[PDB]
């Protein structure tokens, strides 16, 4: 199928520089124009750069002109966004986005989107999380089901990704919005409800990844004897 | 620039019913308009292009209409999976484009009481000098729920944080997580840790508790 796989991003200092990448598969990349679209509070969704199928022309809104540069390498099927002179206002999720074929003119719309990269412009330092088990016990069971989870505490900046059993476990998971602690660090919990009956035969591992600090933690969550 | 204005900002519709979402362009964009559906933390997904042409693989209950400045997205036979924020986008000046500010579609359902669970702090964390106690409220509706932390039956204030999930795409419920965090030294000064939960779906509050010495 068609895919846009985004890499790059994370934390960057005010006035700093950062390059995002997006590799394309499943279609003829050199046939389609691409946009970078960003999303942040207040401003919502807004494009920040556009480039033709061949890279022959680029288009920028006034807000980013002279600071952001879009480019593509159709040999490696990769789209780039070079971000310079970064501003506090530039914190946003940055989406790689594919346009429909220009032969559809005037209907040039966004039919394929990457998964987004969160860029955080801040002078603060990165901090990876501590991951603690939320162990199942008699205090987290009801009606034949048992709740368990992981507490992902004290990281900066967002985001952390949490999966369960390397993605084999998705049903019944709730990974909560992070909270901002008075320290300026984030904390989040991720929980899952499973059968009480199989706690002794099944293995539950939360996989935590904090890409801004390159911290990856797998925590096995064992039942507690209470 | 062309300004896209959506209305309403939010609406709440029962499953099986028909939702009407509006988008107004500040000047005519002919039919050069697209609709997108974005669930939280996911990429927007194209629903309609050309104001009224449904994108491949999109369910028939999504329908776009309009031309010029007034555009409508109609979602019939609404499903819990249709929870999302819906954006319109004009591409009349492509590659220059603008998006509307979004309409958040919330699914109504019947009242559902929370399932309440409590988690004592881990030994890993205690060795670090901190105790976090977590109270979990699973799969309730409506969103409004109150959590009170009681330590040795004393109501707590100022040492907890909570957040609620986005609406669940399968059953339209909410879940809530609340963390009470104390220093290890303060944790060891008390015995009973409890969370008391109030919700429309519960006739009386539900209390989950443990004793620090038992877990």
């Amino acid at each position: 199928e068609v895919q846009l796989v985004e890499s790059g991003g994370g934390l960057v200092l005010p006035g700093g520089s950062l390059r995002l990448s997006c590799s394309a598969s499943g279609f003829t990349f050199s046939d389609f124009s691409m946009h970078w679209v960003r999303q942040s509070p207040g401003k919502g969704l807004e494009y920040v750069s556009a480039i033709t199928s061949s890279g022959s022309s680029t288009y920028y809104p006034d807000s980013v002109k002279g600071r952001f540069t879009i480019s593509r390498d159709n040999s490696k099927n990769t789209l780039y966004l070079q971000m310079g002179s970064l501003r506090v206002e530039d914190t946003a999720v940055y989406w790689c986005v594919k346009n429909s074929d220009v032969f559809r003119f005037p209907h040039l719309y966004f039919d394929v989107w990457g998964r987004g990269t969160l860029v955080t412009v801040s002078s603060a330092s990165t901090k990876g999380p501590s991951v603690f088990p939320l162990a199942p016990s008699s205090k987290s069971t009801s009606g034949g089901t048992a709740a368990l989870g992981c507490l992902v505490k004290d990281y900066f900046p967002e985001p952390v990704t949490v999966s369960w059993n390397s993605g084999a476990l998705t049903s019944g998971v709730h990974t909560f919005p992070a909270v901002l602690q008075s320290s300026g660090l984030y904390s989040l919990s991720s929980v899952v409800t499973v059968p009480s009956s199989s706690l002794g035969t099944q293995t539950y591992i939360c996989n935590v990844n904090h890409k801004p600090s390159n911290t990856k933690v797998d925590k096995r969550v064992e039942p507690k004897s209470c | 620039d062309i300004v896209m204005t959506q209305s309403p900002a939010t609406l709440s519709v029962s499953p099986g019913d028909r939702a009407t979402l509006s988008c107004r362009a500040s000047q005519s964009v002919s039919s050069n308009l697209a609709w997108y559906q974005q669930k939280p933390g996911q990429a927007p997904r194209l629903l309609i292009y050309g104001a009224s042409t449904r994108a491949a693989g999109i369910p028939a209950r999504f329908s776009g209409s309009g031309s010029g400045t007034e555009f409508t997205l109609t979602i019939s036979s609404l499903q819990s999976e249709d929870f999302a924020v819906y954006y319109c986008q004009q591409y009349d000046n492509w590659p220059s484009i603008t998006f509307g500010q979004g309409t958040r579609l919330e699914i109504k359902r019947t009242v559902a009481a929370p399932s309440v669970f409590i988690f004592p702090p881990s030994d890993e964390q205690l060795k670090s000098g901190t105790a976090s106690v977590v109270c979990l409220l699973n799969n309730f509706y409506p969103r409004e729920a109150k959590v009170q932390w009681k330590v040795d039956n004393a109501l707590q204030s100022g040492n907890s944080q909570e957040s609620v999930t986005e609406q669940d795409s399968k059953d339209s419920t909410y879940s809530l997580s609340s963390t009470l965090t104390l220093s290890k030294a303060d944790y060891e000064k008390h015995k009973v840790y409890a969370c008391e939960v109030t919700h429309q779906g519960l006739s009386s509050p539900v209390t989950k508790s443990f004793n620090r010495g038992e877990c």
Binding site: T52, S56, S57, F105 | -
Partner: peptide
């Protein structure tokens, strides 16, 4: 390519 030419018209 044919597409590049039309996209240039739109970008300019």
């Amino acid at each position: 390519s044919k597409r590049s030419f039309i996209e240039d018209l739109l970008f300019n």
